[PDB]
Write a structure and sequence with these properties.
This is Beta-secretase 1. By secondary structure, the protein is mostly beta strands. The protein has two domains: about 130 residues, Cathepsin D, subunit A, domain 1; about 230 residues, Cathepsin D, subunit A, domain 1 (Beta Barrel). Helices cover about 10% and strands about 40% of the residues. The strands form four sheets. It has a six-stranded mixed β-barrel with strand order 2-3-8-4-7-6. The chain has a five-stranded antiparallel beta sheet with strand order 13-12-17-18-25. The chain is globular, with a radius of gyration of 21 Å. Bound molecules: the ligand CCCCNC(=O)[C@H](C)C[C@H](O)[C@@H]1C[C@H](C)CCCCCN(CC)C(=O)c2cc(OCC)cc(c2)C(=O)N1. Ligand E4Y binds next to strand 3 and strand 5.
């Protein structure tokens, strides 16, 4: 019984997906970015030039100070604040209210985004990576412990159609939101949502790297990062192959770094020259894997043309990483992703809001046979 949570996510392209939440008594409404890459629930609690509203602890009668400070650094951005607890609910989520830890953000650096329409972050990953330490219970843990909500959620992130939308199904799977079968990959370790990539193909050709390189030093599923982020060695190989496949057209080197945009006359984007990327994930049974296939419509993110919006302009949404693979929003978009915490696995299926290429199609396909998959995890 999940129809009430369908379409409960909003956002702007490249600025994250948010869900509406309320904090305190009486309830204060805030838009909260959904981040499977972290584990702290934090909200702006002091004025900031990019915040249209913030959490006012003095107006909540159920607020409780924990008299302990907190700091969270991310790959990009950081904030510091004061810890406390309060009553939290999700208007378009389960009909429950829980007491959860809340970090009241008092100072921040490159965290809030001008005009994003969100004021806080909901870290949905595990306690192991919560700050200041893993004794700070994350929100979803509190939700499961205090109510009957099952220990899982799913994310259906939909692309354009600059507005963006989607669904966060709290406590289950909504079968009307995907087609075909769900394919599951083990959660390697409960800290980030860590997975193991066992093979990479571009336009059907194996990159033929040591599969440890794909997971160096980890691979995570992260709704709070836009791009697909790849370790240096993998990024270089992927860009070389993508450049070769599209070499009939000229792009500035700044394009391949995410610095400059590429444009084409409206409706003439040469999709056919950009390859499909297949990520093979470790499966549920011995020597078995499955693949998810990414179309160029996912890793060429449309950007609104600031000048004369007569052209279709895009940014390369694959970037280099020094902290492992990050399967960001552009990978998740077009798939229905099940964070099955109870069974320690992540499921993928083709989304009902999938990308529409005229001759190619995003897919989740299996089974494949893959020997020695555990050797692909980095130690
Ligand atoms: C300390 C405990 C664990 C911390 N976890 C992490 O740091 C994760 C690995 C990352 C988080 O998901 C982390 C979450 C992030 C703050 C949410 C608010 C800002 C979203 C910005 N945005 C729009 C959607 C991006 O696209 C983007 C771009 C980035 O690089 C640009 C060069 C980095 C990150 C995000 C990023 O850092 N996103």
């Amino acid at each position: 019984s999940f129809v009430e949570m369908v379409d409960n996510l909003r956002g702007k392209s490249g600025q994250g997906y948010y869900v509406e939440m309320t904090v305190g008594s009486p309830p204060q409404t805030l838009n909260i970015l959904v981040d499977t890459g972290s584990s702290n629930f934090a909200v702006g609690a002091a004025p900031h030039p990019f915040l249209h509203r913030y959490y006012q602890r003095q107006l909540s009668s159920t607020y409780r100070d924990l008299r302990k400070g907190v700091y969270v650094p991310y790959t990009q951005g950081k904030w510091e604040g004061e810890l406390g607890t309060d009553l939290v609910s999700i208007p378009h989520g389960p009909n429950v209210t829980v007491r959860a830890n809340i970090a009241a953000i008092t100072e921040s650096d490159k965290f809030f985004i001008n005009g994003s329409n969100w004021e806080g972050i909901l870290g949905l990953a595990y306690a192991e990576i919560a700050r200041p330490d893993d004794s700070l219970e994350p929100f979803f843990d509190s939700l499961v412990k205090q109510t009957h909500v099952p220990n899982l959620f799913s994310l259906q992130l939909c692309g354009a159609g600059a507005s963006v939308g989607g669904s966060m199904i709290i406590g289950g799977i909504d079968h009307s939101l995907y087609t075909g079968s769900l394919w599951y990959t083990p959660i390697r370790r409960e800290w980030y949502y860590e997975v193991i990539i066992v093979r990479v193909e571009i336009n059907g050709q194996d990159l033929k790297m040591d599969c440890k390189e794909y997971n160096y030093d980890k691979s995570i599923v992260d709704s709070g990062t836009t791009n697909l982020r790849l370790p240096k060695k993998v990024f270089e190989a992927a860009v070389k192959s993508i450049k070769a496949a599209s070499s009939t057209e000229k792009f500035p080197d700044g394009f391949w770094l995410g610095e400059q945009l590429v444009c084409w006359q409206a409706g003439t984007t040469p999709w056919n020259i950009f390859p499909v990327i297949s990520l093979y994930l470790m499966g549920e049974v011995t020597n078995q894997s499955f693949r998810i296939t990414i179309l160029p419509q996912q890793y060429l993110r449309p950007v609104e043309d600031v000048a004369t919006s007569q052209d279709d302009c895009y940014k390369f949404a694959i970037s280099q990483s020094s902290t492992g693979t990050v399967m960001g929003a552009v990978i998740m978009e077009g798939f229905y992703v099940v964070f099955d915490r109870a069974r320690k696995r992540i499921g993928f299926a083709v989304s009902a809001c999938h990308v529409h290429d005229e001759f190619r199609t995003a897919a989740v396909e299996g089974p494949f046979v893959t020997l020695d998959m555990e050797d692909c995890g980095y130690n």
